[model samples]
Target chain A: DIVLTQSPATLSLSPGERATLSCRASQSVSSNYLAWYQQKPGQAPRLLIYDSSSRATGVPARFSGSGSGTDFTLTISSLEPEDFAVYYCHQYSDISPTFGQGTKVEIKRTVAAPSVFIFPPSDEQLKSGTASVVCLLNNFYPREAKVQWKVDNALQSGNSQESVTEQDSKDSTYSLSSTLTLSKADYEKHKVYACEVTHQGLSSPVTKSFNRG
Target chain B: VQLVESGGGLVQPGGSLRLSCAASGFTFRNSAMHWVRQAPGKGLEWVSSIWYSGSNTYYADSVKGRFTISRDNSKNTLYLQMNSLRAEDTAVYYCARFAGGWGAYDVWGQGTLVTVSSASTKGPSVFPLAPSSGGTAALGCLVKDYFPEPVTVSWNSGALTSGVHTFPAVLQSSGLYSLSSVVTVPSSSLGTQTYICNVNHKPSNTKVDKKVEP
Candidate 1:
């Protein structure tokens, strides 16, 4: 059996850029049994990377795991506000499953509201098969916000992709983008797509319309 | 203990094959041994287990139909034999020992590559379409273009619904399995947002998520 430990149990978060975490095993683990995960306030520990470096299904591109034998690392290339929660690592490769101690990424200060923008696809792309609308969140502090989208007041959760959060460390600000893909029919029919951003900056979620009629 | 795996490089359909695991260092009868496998560019999977003392065996439901686990205490070796093979069965097979931990396989045999066929394989593609909001809303995470068997379907929705799930292992024209799962959310839960679907076809793990919001 191997004991796992995480250092700097708590991190001062702004954006995930350059924020890297480490996991150490008690002994050499060469079978590639090491794994990594993320935990939030109410959510279960999500398996981010397993088999050392191979990522779990559906994890964001920013979260990465690497290392060998007794030393391993989980790096979030870009940190999202939602990422400031406690993170853990689990090893299913040994005698029994063993979990690492918690490492929480905390905020230096509470988050402020985010500035939101919505952009429809360029006409050139629409001419082809691709039609997309981007929901961009910019210049947010503490960078903790959730963005949801709607099509003509109906919830639209399918075909949504969120980009990595980019932080301006010097300014202590962060930004990112979420995009929703739609059929040419929805775009040509003048359908309305809304990007709603929720954070402490606003009492109600902030909304921006990409092609609101 | 040192573990080494030896087996055939090729197994034809309907043809059975045997794999050998030679153990050294630790006493062979002291621990449990397991066989695990994975296809090219895939994730890890449990295959079967054998108790060194009694030579008692256990096999994963996925392979139990045509698989057998046996041991040769005299030779300090474990054997895995299976038949009714398909190209989908091609994978790197390994033998590992159970530690005192959570039945974790600590020491392992370097994997033996097993190819099922005279042929090849492809993707576990994804389908992320729109949500249907008619009375009972339906969202599907469709992954086709298959290979292998029994795909694992999982989720990370923001909230819970008594959502029903299905794992239809439909065979495709190219001998791969077509897979999909649906989570029906009532109009009420459909408004909660953030439903993530994970389609895991050993070696191919795919995830697609969308949100339902105002």
Candidate 2:
């Protein structure tokens, strides 16, 4: 069995900067069958790079992986806000799978609260039975925020929301887009659709609404 | 918020154990709780998790039947119970609270270590008999000259649970250990039947079984 050794236990950088993580194997890995995963504190790991250089499904293009033989590297060309977390390298070409000690990518202690904006439903959404309403959050800091959806003053618990956060190339702040899907019945039943954002360092929550009032 | 894990101890093979995680400084019921563990020099494994509302739970396939996760909202505690333990069950177990990011474990507890050991290397010697009372008969089994400590005893092909009493291992002057177990059953129950005592010791690598005729 091969053992993986990772270097630079911690890497500190500002968002939009380049970050390179290294993993070395004790022996030459066969078939380049190495994988990478990103793990955040208190959460399970998310698979990033697989088959040595290929990014897993839905992973952003900014993240890339490439390596051969005993040395390998995972490169993030322009680190995003959500990318500031722990990374691990694993090898499965040997008799037993092994993982390297993780390397954590932390921001340089910058902080900012987010600005919330709610976008109206599109024409196509009006034609269809369901409408996709978008909530935009801009210039957040420290990579942490919570989003909640409300319709007609009632909390919508059954709706599934998808959120994506990335760093703004021009600055260190981050931007996020959270999408909440609404059906035709929902649009008729609710007069107001509201998006609420809670971020660190904020005295009051930021709220934005699309009022059909 | 802080999490403290407890209830870690040495357990013999085929036994069961319970582990606990106590949380403070936060609303224990507002966030989901999870159980994670790692064996010596091994990677982390997610054992189980319970949702914040206590309405949903998830378990890793590896521990599906033998491991269970539960919580007591009143005490601000989460619990893990493991059954039918073996050598592979030895690990450092951690309790985590989910917060901030999606599915992220923002807070963690100092892990508790559990060791599964069968200390003695020598096989036990089953004695012929002990003492008997009115309508009851007693059988004794002796284990001596062993190292480490703790041994488990079973009777009647491991099915007889009651009427079996195991004594604590005593360290001898020679630096070895000794222990015994006795079982008492009604004399009429032994008619045309033979009683067996099974002793388990790790060093021996096999269980020693002795039979007695009434």
Candidate 3:
């Protein structure tokens, strides 16, 4: 009456983050018969914690159910948004009840917004030789979110602070970047000066700057 | 004495997927197979370990890093290569063998529900290659998770004029396609040979039959 086993088959995280979920039985049981389930996705399989931990009946304290006997554990501390999904751990002392092999808590995703831009001088030079010598943010997706310069890198958004764009309130999926400059008369050598940007709402490189003026 | 699992049942996250187990009765180079998984409702993990012939395996640090076990005494079989899949890996895979002491198995192998979504390629898998080390006998044809590509593989057998050699369909991370088509026939004319992989997958024109007898 013991052969349970379950491990990190998956548990991605993010919702207020936190997860523990392991089951392992194989010997020692009757911590009052053990049990735990969640399933979801199509439906049916609910029943969270019994005996070994207790907390069924509207269950939600962010979920929690502890251990005993063959080292059991089912924590969750803080994770909800419909608590990810798939989970299992059946025991029932010993009439041949066995389950543990499904874990999958999923949903730790990215791409809150990507493909943003700023590039190749939209010239008028903030009306001066002030030629701004600075490009804009490029590439998107939570590359690490909020991607700098919305106003602070300590670049102190004010001297005539002429640009501050965010567009993409989830502007619906899309893609592109580059350039460098800083006065020589506002730099533009006999050079092949080029970097990406098309911005109509861009379906291509939208912005990139190294120090453009 | 059972345990089936053949070729591909469709497992995807990246490109291709593979599966196979065979193992009739016992003693196939002294027992021991393992490769279990569950996902779908979850519960039942452990996913790697093979024995003899393909160089001892035993993976699973959480499946070593995407899986790769192997074995094949002539084809007592065991092989489960999962490359880059991730719908939480989607599961049912099983191949069991050991039975007592840590990680019991006993027998098991009817479980095979692999599936990860966006691969659906039905019908088409031709085989013939059980003789080599010298001479050549490839003749294959498989077409998983298909979706608009440039398939035309041909074989025929009605000289068996081999022309199929395609191998560029992989393209998947859920973008669809998983092709294969070989053509090597020459084991001294392949004993009264019989060939047919004849695909043309346009709007869909299929065929698969290449019985190995050589």
Candidate 4:
């Protein structure tokens, strides 16, 4: 029986970063056939290799493999957001074919919101001893995501907010809200408050801070 | 498409023995049956036997006693039967055939069990109680400890009963085994009855016997 071994249980990479995985077979399986596959959360595994370097039918060109004999390598050229998943290798040399242990690729840090603004900044309105400020964000992918307001590093509670998701011919647009009412003393301590937008698709929470009056 | 002998067992000084090979996939006639035996602590020795034509009967100069090789060409089954046994017949038995000019046993049916025991010294004892004619009387042999080989049952009253005996083959887990042959004696012949179940084995030409009464 031919034994296959793989390296590195987990890998962390940022966008545009490249990652490589290696599989070694016992004995001289140099003439044996090998294949690779990628699997993501809630998705079926996709074939990445066939007969060594030859890619299977519909695999993307971004994913490539090259190696020979008992040693083989599977490389994902540029990390894509959807490429954060596990990969495996298979060999079909002997009577009973076998698969290598898998490796997982994950993002290194949180993703920031796309730099497009839909609404203009609002002026602070003083009523009695309280003031209100608002910011608007749009064009996000995942429909329902949280949008929070942070003053300094502390969270600002009890703020009214709303989001509207519209599907146009191009792509879906997301409307986010950041609203806050502050007392004169509470508002003066922090000159810049951050709208820390948290969404499910990004690797981490993103924050957009602005100066205040 | 090919058959082979895996191994065989020991035979007591005076016991009967038999071995068989079962062919798989191909028709039995496409290949012939060759019986070979390896003596205890020795190499393989070819034993003479029959083939597809039911003619070609050959025997090694060393093989003696009443040993017969037969086959069921239709069933793709080959068998070896030796009678009036003795010791020294203990050896490993294998079945094989020549295919495409190469002689090797590729497919094998486990192995046959054969054991030799002390020959019975006493003669037949008669009883006045006679069974009625045409009634069924059961005859059995208590197979004392023998190698795990299949045993055949036969009813011999006159000329040595040939080929027609019904020998049922059973395998015990331990491989070393025991077997018995049963014959129905005629009620009229029960008063002065002499029925024998002769066993044949390989490697050591040995045969053992047990008498039955009606």
**Model 3: runs farther than 4 Å from truth?**
A1-213, B1-4, B7-21, B24-37, B40-90, B98-103, B106-214
Which consecutive 10 residues in model 2 chain B have the weakest lDDT in total? B124-133
Q: After the best TM-score superposition of candidate 2, give how far the Cα of residue B55 lies from its true spot, in angstroms.
A: 2.7
What is the lDDT for A178 in model 4?
A: 39
> Model 2, B6-113: lDDT tens per residue?
998778888899999999999898988888776644456567778786446777667789988899999999999999887777788889775422324446787888
Across residues A80-160, which tens digit of lDDT does each residue of candidate 3 receive? Answer: 767878888866564344667678776565543343323323344323342222222332332222222322113222222
Clashing residue pairs for model 2: A41-B105, A42-B104, A42-B105, A43-B105
lDDT of 4 by residue, B1-214 (tens): 4453322444456556666677777777866565655443233345654546545666654564477877777766777777666555665565655321222232333344354544332222111111122243333343323443433334463344421223233222223333333333444556575766555543234465545443
TM-score attained by model 4: 0.27
Q: Candidates sorted by DockQ, descending order?
A: 3, 1, 2, 4
Error of 3 at A124 (Å): 33
Give a tens-digit lDDT track for model 3, residues B1-214. Answer: 6778766555445756888889887777776676767764335556776654445676655556777887776788888888777666677777766432222354666667666665444433233322222354444444444553446665664345442344445433445554544455566776566655556555345554544343
Q: Report, for all candidates in order, the number of backbone clashes.
A: 13, 4, 19, 40
**What DockQ, between 0 and 1, does each candidate earn?**
0.03, 0.01, 0.04, 0.00
* Model 4 spans > 4 angstroms off: A110-213, B1-214
TM-score of chain A of each: 0.54, 0.56, 0.27, 0.50
DockQ for model 4 equals 0.00
The TM-score measured for candidate 2 stands at 0.35
